[PDB]
TrEMBL record, chain A:
Top-level lineage group: Eukaryota
Biological processes annotated in GO: mitochondrial electron transport, ubiquinol to cytochrome c
Annotated gene: UQCRB
Organism encoding this protein: Sus scrofa
Protein name: Cytochrome b-c1 complex subunit 7
Functional description taken from the UniProt entry: Component of the ubiquinol-cytochrome c oxidoreductase, a multisubunit transmembrane complex that is part of the mitochondrial electron transport chain which drives oxidative phosphorylation.
Compartments in which it is found: Mitochondrion inner membrane
Main location: mitochondrion
Organism ancestry: Eukaryota, Metazoa, Chordata, Craniata, Vertebrata
Family label: Belongs to the UQCRB/QCR7 family.
Keywords: Electron transport, Membrane, Mitochondrion, Mitochondrion inner membrane, Respiratory chain, Transport
Membrane topology: Peripheral membrane protein
Automatic annotation (TrEMBL), chain B:
Membrane-spanning residues: none
UniProt record similarity statement: Belongs to the UQCR10/QCR9 family.
Topology of this chain in the membrane: Single-pass membrane protein
SUPFAM superfamilies in alphabetical order: Subunit X (non-heme 7 kDa protein) of cytochrome bc1 complex (Ubiquinol-cytochrome c reductase)
Record carries keyword Amino-acid biosynthesis: no
One GO biological process term: mitochondrial electron transport, ubiquinol to cytochrome c
UniProt-listed Gene3D superfamilies: Cytochrome b-c1 complex subunit 9
Family annotation (Pfam families): UCR_UQCRX_QCR9
Principal subcellular localization: mitochondrion
Protein name (record): Complex III subunit 9
Keyword terms of this UniProt record: Electron transport, Membrane, Mitochondrion, Mitochondrion inner membrane, Respiratory chain, Transmembrane, Transmembrane helix, Transport
Protein role: Component of the ubiquinol-cytochrome c oxidoreductase, a multisubunit transmembrane complex that is part of the mitochondrial electron transport chain which drives oxidative phosphorylation. The complex plays an important role in the uptake of multiple carbon sources present in different host niches.
UniProtKB/TrEMBL annotation, chain C:
Family: Belongs to the UQCR11/QCR10 family.
Main location, first listed in the record: mitochondrion
Lineage: Eukaryota, Metazoa, Chordata, Craniata, Vertebrata
Protein keywords: Electron transport, Membrane, Mitochondrion, Mitochondrion inner membrane, Respiratory chain, Transmembrane, Transmembrane helix, Transport
InterPro entries: Single_a-helix_sf (IPR029027), UQCR (IPR015089)
PANTHER family attached to this UniProt entry: CYTOCHROME B-C1 COMPLEX SUBUNIT 10 (PTHR15420:SF2), UBIQUINOL-CYTOCHROME C REDUCTASE COMPLEX 6.4 KD PROTEIN (PTHR15420)
Protein name as it appears in the record: Cytochrome b-c1 complex subunit 10
From TrEMBL, chain D:
Membrane-protein topology: Peripheral membrane protein
Protein name listed in UniProt: Cytochrome b-c1 complex subunit 1, mitochondrial
Molecular function terms, GO-annotated: metal ion binding
Matching Gene3D superfamilies: Metalloenzyme, LuxS/M16 peptidase-like
Signal peptide: none
Complex formation: Component of the ubiquinol-cytochrome c oxidoreductase (cytochrome b-c1 complex, complex III, CIII), a multisubunit enzyme composed of 11 subunits. The complex is composed of 3 respiratory subunits cytochrome b, cytochrome c1 and Rieske protein UQCRFS1, 2 core protein subunits UQCRC1/QCR1 and UQCRC2/QCR2, and 6 low-molecular weight protein subunits UQCRH/QCR6, UQCRB/QCR7, UQCRQ/QCR8, UQCR10/QCR9, UQCR11/QCR10 and subunit 9, the cleavage product of Rieske protein UQCRFS1.
Annotated organism of origin: Sus scrofa
Length: 106, 62, 49, 445
């Protein structure tokens, strides 16, 4: 709707990313998605230099919480270099379900 | 070919499970009143007298 | 949310399963009067008093 | 050029009859090739046990000579032209046809009439055809789809003429004498039982004329004044079971009763078998198909193949399926096969019916391409209906079927009936008869 005041809105987008604390434990955003059966198939389509990175990030950022520290402040994932490496492999599994469905219906 | 009793019996109310289930419910209902009446009567006649009913006419309508 | 039952063919099959079900209430009406000894329904039928 | 205008431009068929009573039919398409044969009414059904294997023994030696072309002189006269020859036999059918070049037509007809009319049962050439036959038996005892369709005719017609096999028991063949081969060919070889047909470049008027010249002394009267009459023979629910625990795969078939040749129920029973389908392990996109069987047996790897067969006769039929399978998967194919039969006489959708009508209309047009196929249809129509049925009529029958017509005709033939079953090893899983019989009725409708 608005554009000039949207520069205000961008500001709050920086606020929430600092409130939720998945950057503090060394993660990126797409590491924290709930894996139902549409996200169990768009993970089996990854190249094997991106699949292994997601395994090492999670296994390190899960043994911090049974020890109850966090990681040094220079090490926090910065806001703008975060990567959406899984949006494109997922907005295709959904787009093909919907199709089997209009078939059966009509 | 000649119409057997079960021939038209199986067609009308024995097919799916549905009418196979209706009659089982209805069958007992037309069965319990006939079976109840003809069971007590033989109890009375076998040894009538002795019971309390067949003497209490000595005490009725004054 | 619940449109996965709402389709051109899906609405048709109801007519394939109402003749079975639309009776299935008559089983209970008869059988209940058997089991719980209903009187008001039993006083509509002249065969059984 | 609408599909509508093209059906009614196909050339028609001419039929005529002789004084003896033999029927003669033809067709013409303006191309440089012809084909001619004779179709006749005989087969293994028609025969007493003392003659179980007789009719397969005559077809085996029609090409081995005659009275005027004594032996080798016959096949050296067809080869120089560049033509072929054939012969087959079924329970009710037998054929003899040729395939040549259009201008050799008077020569072709001479060779046919010389075989069916006067053939030479030379002794000392008997006693040699015998040894080929005895050893022919064992090579097709290792074919497993042909020994399972021989069981199902022996367990569902248990005390009938229609149960005994085509090539006969192995002990009748070893003492089947020469004198017995002259009475089978004298009783069942006579007009009007034969038909003479042709398709291609042929012209009727001269086909009729040659028929006068070469078939004027063909006996038409029946021997003893005896005329056969069928019996609308019985069907039973029965089982058969063979173990063989050192074969890699298992073979299984199963069927119920069906209509006859002239029953008007057949057309909507074709529209329903085309809904089930066919499959094999080398297809493409076989997790993506439209079939209940097709799309599930490919995602889980259950089977190698499956199919649906309808056999028909004068008085009895069959309806069923066949599948070949692993040994740890036998009763997941029964569970899914029967759940589709009940689902079709119970609620059965509309869009599923236009697709299955389209299939059946392509399998009719596609088949009649050639000169061998068209000619083989002409001479079999006569012995089964009269009046070869035009293509314009086959399409206005299919314009009638609806979703409700299919539901009735499935219930009348499938619901709460007794099947017949055949199996070949290694099967232990195959469920008991009391549990196949309880899958023929949903306990709800
Ligand atoms: C193991 C436990 C078995 C239970 C699972 C059965 C599967 C349920 C099912 O989907 O079938 C529907 C069920 C089974 O009958 P069906 O039509 O053949 O269904 C085909 C099944 O998918 C396929 O049938 P199946 O292969 O499952 O048959 C094997 C059979 C063999 O198993 C046995 O029943 C053995 C019984 C002896 C021991 C039982 C001890 C149980 C404790 O088990 C049964 O299915 C019998 C179920 C009947 C009891 C349920 C009645 C409900 C009231 O349908 C009904 O029973 C309808 C009756 C009640 C309808 C009420 C509606 C109005 C309200
Ligand atoms: C009272 C008010 C009204 C009640 C209604 C009538 C009450 C009397 C009960 C009459 C019994 C009716 C028999 C029908 C039962 C039935 O439908 O079973 C179906 C079923 C279908 O199997 P198929 O033969 O293969 O056919 C498949 C067809 N597609 O057949 C059977 O189950 C018959 C086998 C008998 C099973 C015996 C069940 C008893 C076992 C109970 C265990 C004891 C439990 C008690 C402990 C307490 C547990 C909390």
């Amino acid at each position: 709707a608005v554009a000039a005041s949207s520069k205000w809105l961008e500001g709050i987008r920086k606020w929430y990313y600092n409130a939720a604390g998945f950057n503090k434990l060394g993660l990126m955003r797409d590491d924290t998605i709930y894996e139902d059966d549409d996200v169990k198939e768009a993970i089996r389509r990854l190249p094997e230099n991106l699949y292994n990175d997601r395994v090492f990030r999670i296994k390190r950022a899960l043994d911090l919480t049974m020890r109850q520290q966090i990681l040094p402040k220079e090490q926090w994932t910065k806001y703008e270099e975060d990567k959406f490496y899984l949006e494109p492999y997922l907005k295709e599994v959904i787009r093909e379900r919907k199709e089997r469905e209009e078939w059966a219906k009509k | 070919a000649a119409p057997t009793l079960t021939a038209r019996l199986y067609s009308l109310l024995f097919r799916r499970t549905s009418t196979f289930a209706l009659t089982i419910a209805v069958g007992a209902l037309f069965f319990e009143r006939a079976f109840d009446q003809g069971a007590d009567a033989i109890y009375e006649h076998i040894n009538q007298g002795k019971l309390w009913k067949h003497i209490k006419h000595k005490y009725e309508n004054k | 949310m619940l449109s996965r039952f709402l389709g051109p063919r899906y609405r048709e099959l109801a007519r394939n399963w109402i003749p079975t079900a639309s009776m299935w209430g008559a089983v209970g009406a008869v059988g209940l009067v058997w089991a719980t000894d209903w009187r008001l329904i039993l006083d509509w039928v002249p065969y059984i008093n | 050029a609408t599909y509508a205008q093209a059906l009614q431009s196909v050339p028609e068929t001419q039929v005529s009859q002789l004084d003896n009573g033999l029927r003669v039919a033809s067709e013409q398409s303006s191309q440089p090739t012809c084909t001619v044969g004779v179709w006749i009414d005989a087969g293994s059904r028609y025969e007493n046990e003392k003659n179980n294997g007789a009719g397969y023994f005559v077809e085996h030696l029609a090409f081995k000579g005659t009275k005027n072309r004594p032996g080798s002189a016959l096949e050296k006269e067809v080869e120089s032209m560049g033509a072929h020859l054939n012969a087959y036999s079924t329970r009710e059918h037998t054929a003899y046809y040729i395939k040549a070049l259009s201008k050799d037509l008077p020569k072709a007809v001479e060779l046919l009439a010389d075989i069916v009319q006067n053939c030479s049962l030379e002794d000392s050439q008997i006693e040699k055809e015998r040894d080929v036959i005895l050893q022919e038996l064992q090579e097709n005892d290792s074919s497993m789809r042909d020994v399972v369709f021989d069981y199902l005719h022996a367990t569902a017609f248990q005390g009938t003429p229609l149960a005994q096999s085509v090539e006969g028991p192995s002990e009748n063949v070893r003492k089947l004498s020469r004198a017995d081969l002259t009475e089978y060919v004298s009783q069942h070889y006579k007009a009007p039982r034969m038909v003479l047909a042709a398709a291609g470049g042929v012209e009727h008027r001269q086909l009729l004329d040659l028929a006068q010249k070469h078939f004027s002394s063909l006996s038409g009267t029946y021997v003893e004044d005896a005329v056969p009459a069928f019996t609308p023979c019985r069907f039973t629910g029965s089982e058969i079971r063979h173990r063989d625990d050192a074969l890699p795969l298992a073979h299984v078939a199963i069927a119920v009763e069906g209509p006859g040749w002239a029953n008007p129920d057949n057309v909507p029973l074709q529209v329903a078998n085309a809904i089930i389908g066919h499959y094999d392990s080398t297809y493409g996109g076989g997790t993506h198909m439209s079939s209940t069987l097709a799309s599930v047996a490919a995602t889980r790897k259950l089977c190698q193949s499956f199919q649906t067969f309808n056999i028909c006769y004068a008085e009895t039929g069959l309806l069923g399926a066949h599948f070949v399978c692993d040994n740890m998967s036998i009763d997941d194919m029964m569970f899914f096969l029967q759940g589709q039969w009940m689902r079709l006489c119970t609620s059965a959708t509309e869009s599923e019916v236009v697709r299955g009508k389209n299939i059946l209309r392509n399998a009719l047009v596609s088949h009649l391409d050639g000169t061998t196929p068209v000619c083989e249809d002409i001479g079999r129509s006569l012995l089964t209906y009269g009046r070869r049925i035009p293509l314009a009529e086959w399409e206005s029958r299919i314009a009638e079927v609806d979703a409700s017509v299919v539901r009735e005709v499935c219930s009348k033939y499938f619901y709460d009936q007794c099947p017949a079953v055949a199996g070949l090893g290694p099967i232990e899983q195959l469920p008991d008869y009391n549990r196949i019989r309880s899958g023929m009725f949903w306990l709800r409708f």
